[PDB]
Amino acid sequence: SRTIGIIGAPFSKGQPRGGVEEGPTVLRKAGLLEKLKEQECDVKDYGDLPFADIPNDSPFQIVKNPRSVGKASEQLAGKVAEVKKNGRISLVLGGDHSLAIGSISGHARVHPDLGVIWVDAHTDINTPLTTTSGNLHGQPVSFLLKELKGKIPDVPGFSWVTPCISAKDIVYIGLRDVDPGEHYILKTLGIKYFSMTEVDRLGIGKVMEETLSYLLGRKKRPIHLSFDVDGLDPSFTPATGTPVVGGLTYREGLYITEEIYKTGLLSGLDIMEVNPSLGKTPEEVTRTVNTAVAITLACFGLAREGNHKPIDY
Amino acid sequence: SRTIGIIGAPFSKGQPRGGVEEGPTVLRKAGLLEKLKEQECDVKDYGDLPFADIPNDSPFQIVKNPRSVGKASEQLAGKVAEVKKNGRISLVLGGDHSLAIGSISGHARVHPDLGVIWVDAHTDINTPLTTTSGNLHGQPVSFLLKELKGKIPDVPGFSWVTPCISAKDIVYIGLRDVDPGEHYILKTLGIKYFSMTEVDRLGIGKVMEETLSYLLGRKKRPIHLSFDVDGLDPSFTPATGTPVVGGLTYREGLYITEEIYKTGLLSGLDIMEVNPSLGKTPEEVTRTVNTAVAITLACFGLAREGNHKPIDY
Amino acid sequence: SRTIGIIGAPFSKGQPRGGVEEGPTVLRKAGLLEKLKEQECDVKDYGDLPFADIPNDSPFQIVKNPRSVGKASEQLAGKVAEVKKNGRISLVLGGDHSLAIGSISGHARVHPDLGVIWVDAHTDINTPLTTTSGNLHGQPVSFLLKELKGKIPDVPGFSWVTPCISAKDIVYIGLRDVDPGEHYILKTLGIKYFSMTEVDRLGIGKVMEETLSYLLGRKKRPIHLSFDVDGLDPSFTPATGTPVVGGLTYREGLYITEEIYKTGLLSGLDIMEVNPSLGKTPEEVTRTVNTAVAITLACFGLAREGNHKPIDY
Numbered sequence: 057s058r059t060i061g062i063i064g065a066p067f068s069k070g071q072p073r074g075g076v077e078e079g080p081t082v083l084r085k086a087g088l089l090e091k092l093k094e095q096e097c098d099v100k101d102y103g104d105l106p107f108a109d110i111p112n113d114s115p116f117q118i119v120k121n122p123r124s125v126g127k128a129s130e131q132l133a134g135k136v137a138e139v140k141k142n143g144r145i146s147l148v149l150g151g152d153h154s155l156a157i158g159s160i161s162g163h164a165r166v167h168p169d170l171g172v173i174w175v176d177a178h179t180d181i182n183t184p185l186t187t188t189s190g191n192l193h194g195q196p197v198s199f200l201l202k203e204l205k206g207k208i209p210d211v212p213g214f215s216w217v218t219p220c221i222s223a224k225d226i227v228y229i230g231l232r233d234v235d236p237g238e239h240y241i242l243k244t245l246g247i248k249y250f251s252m253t254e255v256d257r258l259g260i261g262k263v264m265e266e267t268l269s270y271l272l273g274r275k276k277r278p279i280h281l282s283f284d285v286d287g288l289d290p291s292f293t294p295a296t297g298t299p300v301v302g303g304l305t306y307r308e309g310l311y312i313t314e315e316i317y318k319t320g321l322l323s324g325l326d327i328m329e330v331n332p333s334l335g336k337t338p339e340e341v342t343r344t345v346n347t348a349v350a351i352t353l354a355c356f357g358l359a360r361e362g363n364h365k366p367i368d369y
Numbered sequence: 370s371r372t373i374g375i376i377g378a379p380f381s382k383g384q385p386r387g388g389v390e391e392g393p394t395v396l397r398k399a400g401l402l403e404k405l406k407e408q409e410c411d412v413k414d415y416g417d418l419p420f421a422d423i424p425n426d427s428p429f430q431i432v433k434n435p436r437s438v439g440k441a442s443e444q445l446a447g448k449v450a451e452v453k454k455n456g457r458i459s460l461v462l463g464g465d466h467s468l469a470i471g472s473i474s475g476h477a478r479v480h481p482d483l484g485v486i487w488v489d490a491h492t493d494i495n496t497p498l499t500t501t502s503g504n505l506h507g508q509p510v511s512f513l514l515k516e517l518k519g520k521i522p523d524v525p526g527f528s529w530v531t532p533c534i535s536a537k538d539i540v541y542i543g544l545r546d547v548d549p550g551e552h553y554i555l556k557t558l559g560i561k562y563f564s565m566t567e568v569d570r571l572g573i574g575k576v577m578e579e580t581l582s583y584l585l586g587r588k589k590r591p592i593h594l595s596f597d598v599d600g601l602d603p604s605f606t607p608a609t610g611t612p613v614v615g616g617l618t619y620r621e622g623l624y625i626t627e628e629i630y631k632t633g634l635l636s637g638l639d640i641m642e643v644n645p646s647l648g649k650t651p652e653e654v655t656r657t658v659n660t661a662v663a664i665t666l667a668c669f670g671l672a673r674e675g676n677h678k679p680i681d682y
Numbered sequence: 683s684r685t686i687g688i689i690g691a692p693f694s695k696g697q698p699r700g701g702v703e704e705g706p707t708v709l710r711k712a713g714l715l716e717k718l719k720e721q722e723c724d725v726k727d728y729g730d731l732p733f734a735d736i737p738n739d740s741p742f743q744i745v746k747n748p749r750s751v752g753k754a755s756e757q758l759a760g761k762v763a764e765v766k767k768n769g770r771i772s773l774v775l776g777g778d779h780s781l782a783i784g785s786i787s788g789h790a791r792v793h794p795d796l797g798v799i800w801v802d803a804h805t806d807i808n809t810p811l812t813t814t815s816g817n818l819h820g821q822p823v824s825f826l827l828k829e830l831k832g833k834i835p836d837v838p839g840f841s842w843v844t845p846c847i848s849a850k851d852i853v854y855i856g857l858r859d860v861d862p863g864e865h866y867i868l869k870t871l872g873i874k875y876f877s878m879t880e881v882d883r884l885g886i887g888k889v890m891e892e893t894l895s896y897l898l899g900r901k902k903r904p905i906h907l908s909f910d911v912d913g914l915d916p917s918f919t920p921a922t923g924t925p926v927v928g929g930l931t932y933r934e935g936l937y938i939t940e941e942i943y944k945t946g947l948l949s950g951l952d953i954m955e956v957n958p959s960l961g962k963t964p965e966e967v968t969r970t971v972n973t974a975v976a977i978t979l980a981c982f983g984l985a986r987e988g989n990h991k992p993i994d995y
């Protein structure tokens with residue numbers, strides 16, 4: 057049965073807007089733990105990581121808050137590796153996606169053979185040298201790829217990092233806003249991806265069939281799902297820092313996760329970029345969090361066709 | 370040509386909210402009869418069933434308004450069997466889905482070999498003993514299935530009922546909120562269904578291909594379509610008692626019905642759960658009724674590709 | 683590389699509502715030229731056609747403003763043929779779709795072998811004798827089809843017209859509101875089309891596969907894409923004269939154009955029916971124009987998966 061390890065990560069210095077550090081709060085008050093337990097889920101809450109304050113953290117070239125970001129991920133990596141050693145699926149209620157660096161890092165320490173599925177409107181694969189924004193939530197994957205070692209300069213706060221995944225161990229789904237440098241990296245490293253164009257062409261059904269086959273083809277291995285809230289259309293998750301029109305639908309979002317759950321291989325989960333303060337109205341915030349919870353519950357068994365206990369009703 | 374028999378069924382005691390008894394009214398004033406006639410439809414209106422008032426109708430265990438519900442369906446069954454004997458397709462403009470009991474019952478009296486397609490966000494297959502809500506609009510199918518005879522206790526008002534369909538003669542489409550007892554019944558009786566997950570996986574095209582093949586495989590037989598308005602997403606039909614996000618789209622709704630029409634086998638039709646009083650704004654009511662009419666017109670020939678008469682334009 | 687020739691066509695007398703003549707304006711101020719240049723596009727703006735005023739233009743039977751419409755298209759045809767001779771893809775920022783007559787006409791003068799893809803909720807194939815509205819924006823295709831020569835009476839202003847395409851050289855996508863006479867013409871001339879029903883059945887992926895195969899089967903030839911803004915659902919392009927619910931999605935709209943771009947055969951493009959004055963709110967106008975620009979940029983290379991230059995990033 058799916059045993060979960062909850063990790064609240066109220067961090068925002070991976071991007072300019074601040075309300076994202078409130079993500080764990082709103083998701084918890086939405087009753088996420090209760091609802092997960094309302095299922096057959098064994099849930100242990102490891103709490104909200106107390107993220108230090110690094111007042112002295114000047115830019116590294118154009119890269120912003122490098123020491124703060126580097127420290128949050130280093131802290132998070134230890135936590136994630138802790139829950140993984142406790143035999144539970146790590147659920148990181150995040151702030152910004154920069155935390156992916158620590159989440160996937162800590163997960164790989166315990167399961168070096170993990171495969172990653174990255175649901176996002178963006179690739180977040182900019183290097184400190186290709187980024188034009190300097191925001192680290194758009195650079196996580198670059199720190200994690202072994203093939204990019206030698207192209208990632210020494211950024212204050214990330215000396216603890218060691219690339220744990222190969223370009224062949226990750227699949228993107230939902231892309232619709234990729235920088236030119238990021239696109240160059242995609243095609244150069246031969247990274248497997250399904251942009252909104254491929255979802256439109258093939259259908260989410262075929263997309264998931266190919267994604268799982270691609271990652272679990274040679275052999276079965278742990279799965280790390282890093283779900284960026286903006287991967288879904290802004291009509292479903294408006295309270296997010298960088299929304300892009302024409303995203304994955306609510307149904308597609310649930311299909312992605314229902315399928316992953318069914319592999320029985322989900323090992324790590326990230327629910328990122330939910331920023332309640334960016335909701336233009338009280339219900340945009342409610343609509344976003346509700347959708348984020350729904351997708352989280354899907355990862356752990358909630359099926360739209362229904363569920364029932366091993367009893368004769 | 371599609372000859373129709375209209376039956377207004379202003380009934381609401383199958384669920385707690387009352388505005389649903391206004392369904393026939395708003396659908397008629399939307400010009401449904403005129404529009405149907407604006408097509409090549411032969412339409413005879415059998416009127417709005419005068420539903421009796423049963424002041425004395427205490428709960429049966431937890432089941433609410435059993436005598437009122439049982440009587441409305443018994444009345445409706447006779448009407449439907451009447452129009453079927455008049456060689457016309459029964460169109461039941463309903464209130465709540467509890468009326469399905471009488472609609473399908475009366476239809477089967479004349480055509481015991483009918484197949485049922487149930488478009489709904491719910492299975493409505495709870496028994497008086499599995500229901501937790503006590504609302505009869507979520508129990509109709511349980512009264513109709515032969516295999517469940519022996520599990521349906523004697524509820525005041527339904528002694529006239531006799532299960533007329535087998536688990537193999539029904540197909541669900543659109544499910545996204547099924548109780549645990551209902552899910553147990555689905556898998557136990559081996560009922561064929563396409564939840565939103567299957568629609569996402571296969572596409573409405575394949576879904577309809579399999580549905581009709583499944584029901585008309587061995588041989589051609591009359592079709593009864595019980596369309597619950599909440600089977601479509603609440604962005605299309607918001608004025609309904611129990612809306613559930615992530616529903617069938619407008620297009621899918623029309624595709625379902627255009628395909629059924631084309632079989633030339635539509636024998637019975639239910640348009641249920643439209644509740645004008647639940648629309649939060651005047652246009653939510655207009656948007657709901659408009660969609661309900663559009664889907665009704667599709668059942669009787671209106672095609673999105675166009676239609677034309679046997680003349681040289 | 684895609685070299686473009688911009689042609690502003692502020693014309694509205696092809697239909698009753700007037701704000702459509704503002705289409706070139708809002709599209710230009712949305713930064714369309716800048717954005718196209720922000721790509722690898724060679725853009726030359728031929729300006730906004732100064733459309734004459736024909737005060738004396740009484741109806742022809744029921745056909746409205748025939749001389750004004752006929753003159754605008756005649757003018758436009760010369761312009762389009764001019765840009766085509768300059769070796770550039772004609773981009774007609776239009777007013778109403780009646781301009782299609784001149785756009786496709788002028789294009790065919792230089793490339794008589796062109797194939798047409800018509801994205802629209804309507805067929806716009808009514809003849810002066812089949813039309814019931816008398817509005818010429820719903821009759822363009824009838825003037826262009828060789829097979830309909832002999833059925834198009836002499837309308838003041840169109841004596842310069844000479845049917846340049848056969849029924850076999852055009853494909854419709856998005857149809858959902860076709861008159862009976864139009865439908866008769868579709869089936870009689872055996873015109874290939876994909877109404878919303880076919881998109882629902884096959885998926886936009888298969889639809890585009892069949893469309894391009896159909897038109898480029900025997901051999902490769904120039905493509906003329908006449909994109910009517912109302913071909914997309916009104917939730918994306920509300921500021922348009924004749925919206926119809928259940929249209930093509932934003933994603934589908936981009937998929938259509940991304941695919942066409944990739945053929946490397948786009949030869950002519952029409953962006954029609956954008957009417958800023960019909961937007962009920964300031965953002966409905968913004969949402970419409972934004973979508974119209976997005977689809978225009980897709981026609982010329984902008985891909986959702988990303989783009990990059992031939993350099994080592």
Ligand SMILES: N=C(N)NC[C@H](N)C(=O)O
Binds near residue numbers: 178188190193195235
């Ligand atoms: N993670 C995001 N939103 N990335 C977008 C943009 N390429 C940036 O790297 O700042």
Ligand SMILES: N=C(N)NC[C@H](N)C(=O)O
Binds near residue numbers: 503508611
């Ligand atoms: N028909 C509905 N809405 N059913 C839902 C719920 N299972 C109930 O049986 O009350």
Ligand SMILES: N=C(N)NC[C@H](N)C(=O)O
Binds near residue numbers: 808814815819860924
């Ligand atoms: N182009 C449009 N909107 N056509 C619709 C209608 N058949 C008319 O020809 O006026």
Ligand SMILES: [Mn+2]
Binds near residue numbers: 176177284298
């Ligand atoms: Mn993102």
Ligand SMILES: [Mn+2]
Binds near residue numbers: 176
């Ligand atoms: Mn991201």
Ligand SMILES: [Mn+2]
Binds near residue numbers: 490491597600
């Ligand atoms: Mn329902």
Ligand SMILES: [Mn+2]
Binds near residue numbers: 466489491597
């Ligand atoms: Mn129902």
Ligand SMILES: [Mn+2]
Binds near residue numbers: 802
């Ligand atoms: Mn149109």
Ligand SMILES: [Mn+2]
Binds near residue numbers: 806910
């Ligand atoms: Mn048009």
